[PDB]
Motif scaffolding. Structure first.
Motif, PDB file in Angstrom:
ATOM      1  N   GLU A 190       0.849  -1.186   0.000  1.00 49.54           N
ATOM      2  CA  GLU A 190       0.000   0.000   0.000  1.00 49.54           C
ATOM      3  C   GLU A 190       0.891   1.245   0.000  1.00 49.54           C
ATOM      4  O   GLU A 190       1.737   1.422   0.889  1.00 49.54           O
ATOM      5  N   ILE A 191       0.727   2.088  -1.016  1.00 50.69           N
ATOM      6  CA  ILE A 191       1.624   3.205  -1.268  1.00 50.69           C
ATOM      7  C   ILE A 191       0.791   4.464  -1.447  1.00 50.69           C
ATOM      8  O   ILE A 191       0.055   4.593  -2.435  1.00 50.69           O
TER       9      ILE A 191
ATOM     10  N   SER B 178      16.599  17.003   3.328  1.00 47.17           N
ATOM     11  CA  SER B 178      15.373  16.436   2.784  1.00 47.17           C
ATOM     12  C   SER B 178      15.156  15.081   3.428  1.00 47.17           C
ATOM     13  O   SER B 178      16.126  14.388   3.747  1.00 47.17           O
ATOM     14  N   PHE B 179      13.886  14.701   3.603  1.00 42.16           N
ATOM     15  CA  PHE B 179      13.614  13.421   4.245  1.00 42.16           C
ATOM     16  C   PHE B 179      12.178  12.994   3.968  1.00 42.16           C
ATOM     17  O   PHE B 179      11.284  13.838   3.804  1.00 42.16           O
ATOM     18  N   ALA B 180      11.983  11.668   3.898  1.00 38.20           N
ATOM     19  CA  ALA B 180      10.655  11.060   3.864  1.00 38.20           C
ATOM     20  C   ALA B 180       9.990  11.172   5.228  1.00 38.20           C
ATOM     21  O   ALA B 180      10.645  11.021   6.260  1.00 38.20           O
TER      22      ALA B 180
ATOM     23  N   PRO C   1       8.025   6.629   5.425  1.00 37.94           N
ATOM     24  CA  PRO C   1       8.329   5.872   4.214  1.00 37.94           C
ATOM     25  C   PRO C   1       7.818   4.445   4.250  1.00 37.94           C
ATOM     26  O   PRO C   1       7.978   3.732   3.255  1.00 37.94           O
TER      27      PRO C   1
ATOM     28  N   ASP D 286       5.384   8.161   0.046  1.00 42.95           N
ATOM     29  CA  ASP D 286       6.595   8.668  -0.565  1.00 42.95           C
ATOM     30  C   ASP D 286       6.744  10.176  -0.385  1.00 42.95           C
ATOM     31  O   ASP D 286       7.595  10.788  -1.040  1.00 42.95           O
TER      32      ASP D 286
ATOM     33  N   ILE E  63      12.159  18.757  13.972  1.00 45.68           N
ATOM     34  CA  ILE E  63      13.495  18.827  13.376  1.00 45.68           C
ATOM     35  C   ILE E  63      13.983  20.272  13.356  1.00 45.68           C
ATOM     36  O   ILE E  63      15.095  20.586  13.804  1.00 45.68           O
TER      37      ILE E  63
ATOM     38  N   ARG F 241      -3.928  -3.608   4.751  1.00 43.55           N
ATOM     39  CA  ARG F 241      -3.125  -4.144   5.835  1.00 43.55           C
ATOM     40  C   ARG F 241      -2.512  -3.024   6.676  1.00 43.55           C
ATOM     41  O   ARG F 241      -2.503  -3.107   7.911  1.00 43.55           O
ATOM     42  N   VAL F 242      -2.016  -1.964   6.031  1.00 39.77           N
ATOM     43  CA  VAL F 242      -1.265  -0.908   6.700  1.00 39.77           C
ATOM     44  C   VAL F 242      -2.073   0.381   6.807  1.00 39.77           C
ATOM     45  O   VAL F 242      -2.028   1.064   7.831  1.00 39.77           O
ATOM     46  N   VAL F 243      -2.815   0.736   5.770  1.00 38.92           N
ATOM     47  CA  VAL F 243      -3.482   2.025   5.717  1.00 38.92           C
ATOM     48  C   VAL F 243      -4.971   1.813   5.501  1.00 38.92           C
ATOM     49  O   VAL F 243      -5.388   0.924   4.749  1.00 38.92           O
TER      50      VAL F 243
ATOM     51  N   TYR G 269      14.254  -1.825   3.653  1.00 36.66           N
ATOM     52  CA  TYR G 269      13.727  -1.547   2.328  1.00 36.66           C
ATOM     53  C   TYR G 269      12.387  -0.817   2.429  1.00 36.66           C
ATOM     54  O   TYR G 269      11.457  -1.283   3.099  1.00 36.66           O
ATOM     55  N   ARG G 270      12.280   0.326   1.763  1.00 41.59           N
ATOM     56  CA  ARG G 270      11.073   1.135   1.804  1.00 41.59           C
ATOM     57  C   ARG G 270      10.502   1.206   0.391  1.00 41.59           C
ATOM     58  O   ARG G 270      10.909   2.055  -0.416  1.00 41.59           O
ATOM     59  N   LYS G 271       9.551   0.309   0.111  1.00 44.54           N
ATOM     60  CA  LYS G 271       8.933   0.253  -1.214  1.00 44.54           C
ATOM     61  C   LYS G 271       8.422   1.607  -1.707  1.00 44.54           C
ATOM     62  O   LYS G 271       8.680   1.936  -2.876  1.00 44.54           O
ATOM     63  N   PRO G 272       7.714   2.426  -0.901  1.00 43.16           N
ATOM     64  CA  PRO G 272       7.252   3.733  -1.420  1.00 43.16           C
ATOM     65  C   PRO G 272       8.378   4.620  -1.917  1.00 43.16           C
ATOM     66  O   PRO G 272       8.144   5.479  -2.771  1.00 43.16           O
ATOM     67  N   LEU G 273       9.596   4.430  -1.407  1.00 45.34           N
ATOM     68  CA  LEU G 273      10.742   5.192  -1.861  1.00 45.34           C
ATOM     69  C   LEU G 273      11.554   4.492  -2.953  1.00 45.34           C
ATOM     70  O   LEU G 273      12.415   5.144  -3.548  1.00 45.34           O
TER      71      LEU G 273
ATOM     72  N   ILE H  68      23.503  11.300   6.478  1.00 41.82           N
ATOM     73  CA  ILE H  68      22.564  12.330   6.076  1.00 41.82           C
ATOM     74  C   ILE H  68      23.040  13.009   4.801  1.00 41.82           C
ATOM     75  O   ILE H  68      22.235  13.346   3.933  1.00 41.82           O
TER      76      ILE H  68
ATOM     77  N   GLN I  81      22.143  10.916   2.026  1.00 35.99           N
ATOM     78  CA  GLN I  81      20.730  10.560   2.126  1.00 35.99           C
ATOM     79  C   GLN I  81      20.522   9.057   2.331  1.00 35.99           C
ATOM     80  O   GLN I  81      19.467   8.517   1.983  1.00 35.99           O
TER      81      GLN I  81
ATOM     82  N   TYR J 115      17.225   9.145   5.918  1.00 34.64           N
ATOM     83  CA  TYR J 115      16.325   9.877   5.024  1.00 34.64           C
ATOM     84  C   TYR J 115      14.861   9.811   5.462  1.00 34.64           C
ATOM     85  O   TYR J 115      13.977  10.012   4.622  1.00 34.64           O
ATOM     86  N   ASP J 116      14.563   9.537   6.722  1.00 35.44           N
ATOM     87  CA  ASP J 116      13.211   9.726   7.206  1.00 35.44           C
ATOM     88  C   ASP J 116      13.291  10.514   8.503  1.00 35.44           C
ATOM     89  O   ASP J 116      14.374  10.711   9.077  1.00 35.44           O
ATOM     90  N   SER J 117      12.131  11.005   8.933  1.00 39.33           N
ATOM     91  CA  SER J 117      12.167  12.079   9.903  1.00 39.33           C
ATOM     92  C   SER J 117      12.485  11.575  11.306  1.00 39.33           C
ATOM     93  O   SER J 117      13.184  12.275  12.047  1.00 39.33           O
TER      94      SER J 117
ATOM     95  N   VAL K  13      16.293  11.301  11.456  1.00 32.20           N
ATOM     96  CA  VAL K  13      16.932  12.615  11.532  1.00 32.20           C
ATOM     97  C   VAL K  13      16.775  13.203  12.927  1.00 32.20           C
ATOM     98  O   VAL K  13      17.716  13.783  13.488  1.00 32.20           O
TER      99      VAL K  13
END
Lengths: 180, 177
Positions: free
Chosen positions: A36-37, A107-109, A112, A116, A164, B18-20, B63-67, B149, B152, B155-157, B160
């Protein structure tokens, strides 16, 4: 490089803010799995510190949270526009400020695991007030670092880009007290 | 707060996976007009900042499929109904990294993507770690994290936020030692 190759895609929803798609992906298994994306245009957000050391923020209702929260100014990336122009326009439209510098920080997701969405944070230096929608409800706010920190404690500041941002100001000040 | 509150006048469920979950609300604006609100419902998570005795931050490659990308993150897991998230933090740390810890204290909670999702992350700090495939396990000094960083790879909040917490530790230890 590891991949879950998409072998099918189902477009479930294509709204004004987000699209939802379900990707069917191969596993090292040889079996398949649904991903699910949520697809999202991306956002520019601005860390804007006045000449008075006050960080500029906005309060608005975030319907998924059923609460208003205090955030740095941000707006969506536009197709075929410079994100730095986008940050400049969003600073001025949302808070009536102009600035001298607008420099990309990071920059950051944001989540994720299912989205995206990417946020691009820009720092604005050299702020001054420009002089001169009915459906937009924002509340312009300017805080000292200590007030921002107290807003975190109160959970008025409650989202990742603004946490942040606040932490960055904390660091800039601590390294400003590493030279005094 | 409740500033500019937008009352739901009508909800429509779009999707339940399943997730959303996705729904569309019709809402009343503060000026009486109507608008539409797209809302992803997500369980919410606990995440752990873990600093080893070598002063390295503990991270895992995911692994982040959406990215379309593998990124380097602090360990995290879904909330569990009825379980204190602090207990959830301790379990997630241990099964993701093999570390136990002597202290697990809540630092901060925040919404990841409040424009459209109700996902809340609860971040806990694990102190005093010790070890009991772990191939995705990655331990980083502050300076490698700052380099991650730059590339990247981080790379998620939430991650960071964690590197910045490590940075603030260093710029405050430097005031006392």
């Amino acid at each position: 490089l590891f991949e879950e190759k998409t072998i099918k895609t189902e477009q479930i929803f294509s709204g004004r803010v987000v699209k939802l798609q379900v990707d069917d992906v191969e596993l090292p298994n040889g079996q398949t799995s649904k991903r699910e994306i949520v697809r999202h245009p991306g956002a520019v957000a601005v860390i804007a510190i006045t000449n008075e050391n006050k960080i500029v923020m906005v309060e608005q209702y975030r319907k998924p949270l059923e609460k208003s929260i205090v955030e740095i100014p941000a707006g969506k990336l536009e197709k075929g526009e410079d994100p730095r122009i986008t940050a400049l326009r969003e600073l001025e439209e949302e808070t009536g400020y102009e600035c001298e510098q607008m420099e990309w920080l990071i920059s950051f997701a944001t989540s994720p695991g299912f989205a995206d969405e990417i946020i691009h944070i820009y720092v604005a230096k050299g702020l001054s007030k420009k002089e001169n929608d009915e459906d937009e409800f924002v509340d312009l706010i300017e805080l000292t670092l200590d007030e921002a920190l107290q807003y975190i404690k109160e959970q008025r500041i409650y989202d990742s880009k603004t946490v942040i941002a606040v932490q960055y100001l904390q660091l800039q000040e601590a390294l400003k007290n590493k030279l005094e």
